[PDB]
Amino acid sequence: MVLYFIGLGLYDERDITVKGLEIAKKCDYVFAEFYTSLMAGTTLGRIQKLIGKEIRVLSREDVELNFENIVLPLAKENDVAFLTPGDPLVATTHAELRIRAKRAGVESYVIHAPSIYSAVGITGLHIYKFGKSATVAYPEGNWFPTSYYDVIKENAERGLHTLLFLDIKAEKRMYMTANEAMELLLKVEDMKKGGVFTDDTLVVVLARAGSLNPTIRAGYVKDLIREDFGDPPHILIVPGKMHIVEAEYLVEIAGAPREILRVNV
Amino acid sequence: MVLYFIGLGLYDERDITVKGLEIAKKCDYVFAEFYTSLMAGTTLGRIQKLIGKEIRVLSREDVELNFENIVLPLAKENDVAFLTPGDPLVATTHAELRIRAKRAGVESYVIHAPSIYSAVGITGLHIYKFGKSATVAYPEGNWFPTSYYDVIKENAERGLHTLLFLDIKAEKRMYMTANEAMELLLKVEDMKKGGVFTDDTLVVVLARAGSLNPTIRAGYVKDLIREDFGDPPHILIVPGKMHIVEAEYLVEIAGAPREILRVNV
Numbered sequence: 177m178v179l180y181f182i183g184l185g186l187y188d189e190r191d192i193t194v195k196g197l198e199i200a201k202k203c204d205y206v207f208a209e210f211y212t213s214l215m216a217g218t219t220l221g222r223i224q225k226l227i228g229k230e231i232r233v234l235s236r237e238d239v240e241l242n243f244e245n246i247v248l249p250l251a252k253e254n255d256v257a258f259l260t261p262g263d264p265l266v267a268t269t270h271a272e273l274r275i276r277a278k279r280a281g282v283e284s285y286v287i288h289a290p291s292i293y294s295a296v297g298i299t300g301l302h303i304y305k306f307g308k309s310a311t312v313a314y315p316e317g318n319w320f321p322t323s324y325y326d327v328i329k330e331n332a333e334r335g336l337h338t339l340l341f342l343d344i345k346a347e348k349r350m351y352m353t354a355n356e357a358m359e360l361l362l363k364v365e366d367m368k369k370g371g372v373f374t375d376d377t378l379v380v381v382l383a384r385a386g387s388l389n390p391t392i393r394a395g396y397v398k399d400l401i402r403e404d405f406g407d408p409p410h411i412l413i414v415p416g417k418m419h420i421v422e423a424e425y426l427v428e429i430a431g432a433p434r435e436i437l438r439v440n441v
Numbered sequence: 442m443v444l445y446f447i448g449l450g451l452y453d454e455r456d457i458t459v460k461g462l463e464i465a466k467k468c469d470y471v472f473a474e475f476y477t478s479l480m481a482g483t484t485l486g487r488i489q490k491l492i493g494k495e496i497r498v499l500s501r502e503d504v505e506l507n508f509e510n511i512v513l514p515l516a517k518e519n520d521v522a523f524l525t526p527g528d529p530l531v532a533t534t535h536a537e538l539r540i541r542a543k544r545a546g547v548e549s550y551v552i553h554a555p556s557i558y559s560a561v562g563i564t565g566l567h568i569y570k571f572g573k574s575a576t577v578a579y580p581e582g583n584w585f586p587t588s589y590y591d592v593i594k595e596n597a598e599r600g601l602h603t604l605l606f607l608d609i610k611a612e613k614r615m616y617m618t619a620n621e622a623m624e625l626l627l628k629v630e631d632m633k634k635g636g637v638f639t640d641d642t643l644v645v646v647l648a649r650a651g652s653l654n655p656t657i658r659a660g661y662v663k664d665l666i667r668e669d670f671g672d673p674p675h676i677l678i679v680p681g682k683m684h685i686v687e688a689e690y691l692v693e694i695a696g697a698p699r700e701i702l703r704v705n706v
């Protein structure tokens with residue numbers, strides 16, 4: 177009579193922790209969602225084989241509206257697991273689901289897994305220097321989201337890096353690329369003209385973290401805006417004031433122009 | 442010819458990922474460091490048994506000053522692994538170790554694992570709202586560093602949460618407790634008087650992230666400064682103004698007083 181929130185990790189089914197695997201293998205019922213992120217290197221079938229269980233995939237509606245009707249009822253008489261990409265509580269609203277579990281008298285536990293939030297470390301940028309985070313959302317109809325632009329501005333002013341989560345529309349199999357993110361940003365820049373994101377802005381792209389060969393690229397928007405970074409998922413990062421070893425890493429590892437080695441202090 | 446940076450995760454020997462465990466097992470040599478952090482829920486003996494490889498522990502100096510003469514040489518003609526607590530490359534200086542690998546003509550790959558940076562999501566606080574991070578350092582002799590205090594000030598002022606790592610003396614196995622951290626901050630508040638950290642400041646304490654039974658507590662300093670949060674390590678968080686949902690989570694899951702639902706939202 178327990179509910180387990182278990183992260184599956186960044187790229188494939190092997191990104192789950194041993195703890196998460198062993199516990200999942202022994203749960204009576206296994207549920208999962210694949211709309212909060214994209215695990216590019218695996219399939220539902222492969223996950224099921226590893227875990228040795230049939231997995232009922234839930235939609236955003238099933239979860240956000242009927243979690244307490246579809247999942248919780250079972251966790252009252254069985255060991256239930258709810259799997260998610262990356263870490264179940266990072267950049268999702270799944271934390272609120274623990275409140276529902278409690279109000280239903282269902283104890284819940286959380287098994288973490290590698291998350292894109294900490295994986296940014298592979299970019300060479302000191303993780304403690306990241307400021308507020310944001311999401312570049314797809315414009316819809318006449319509505320054009322722009323808040324993520326202000327986040328970059330605020331962080332840049334303090335010299336902090338900015339992690340930009342990119343939009344996703346799983347049901348339509350749409351995964352925003354870093355290129356689309358850059359195009360949207362230049363459009364916002366054209367509107368606000370704050371000198372926040374231009375063709376000369378240095379950016380970093382991390383694609384398919386978790387795989388053995390993720391794409392890690394750094395450079396100016398003008399050079400990267402049309403570059404192919406491979407299949408999604410992707411994240412875009414706007415560095416703040418860099419330390420010398422950060423720039424050196426971006427150059428030696430992310431193929432950035434040696435030009436950035438000459439850091440301004 | 443290959444070097445694998447593999448994360449060990451948060452608390453015990455089962456916090457490594459399946460991918461990390463399988464790659465570790467096929468390595469000819471396995472190194473590890475426990476000076477950046479300590480796996481409090483397990484032992485070196487237990488980690489060695491799970492991986493089935495003897496583990497050569499490296500000191501801070503072995504890594505920072507001699508990585509290239511201790512680890513890379515073997516990485517030249519064998520598969521070598523370098524284990525670190527948490528997610529690889531989170532520790533500030535680890536990223537440049539990949540540059541060293543390159544310089545030595547050695548290929549390197551990163552196998553992620555859970556990190557406290559993402560695991561703090563279990564506190565209910567939205568990850569995107571975290572700002573710059575810092576470490577609470579013990580004063581000593583004539584040196585009294587307070588930068589971590591300014592970090593909290595800058596984040597809070599912008600409605601951002603502040604993740605605070607607490608000082609640790611790995612070799613001597615001595616951890617700073619959230620209680621000690623709170624006392625130190627009050628003294629800094631007494632020195633600077635910025636109205637940043639007082640008896641009325643609301644804080645969150647996270648102990649033993651990764652465990653199935655972690656300690657998550659939220660409340661005002663005047664009430665938590667002398668509370669027993671259990672064995673280390675401890676993580677201290679000073680939230681900024683909260684989203685009603687964040688506060689409800691702390692109230693419902695971390696035993697925070699109802700008061701925060703109106704004073705800190």
Ligand SMILES: Nc1ncnc2c1ncn2[C@@H]1O[C@H](CSCC[C@H](N)C(=O)O)[C@@H](O)[C@H]1O
Nearest residue numbers: 213262263266267291292342384385409410
């Ligand atoms: N492996 C990966 N590589 C690059 N970006 C990734 C990624 N996994 C997730 N993301 C990014 O994060 C967004 C989903 S946000 C949900 C994140 C998840 N809880 C975690 O812990 O990682 C994606 O749209 C993408 O921009």
Ligand code: NA
Nearest residue numbers: 306571572574
């Ligand atoms: Na952060």
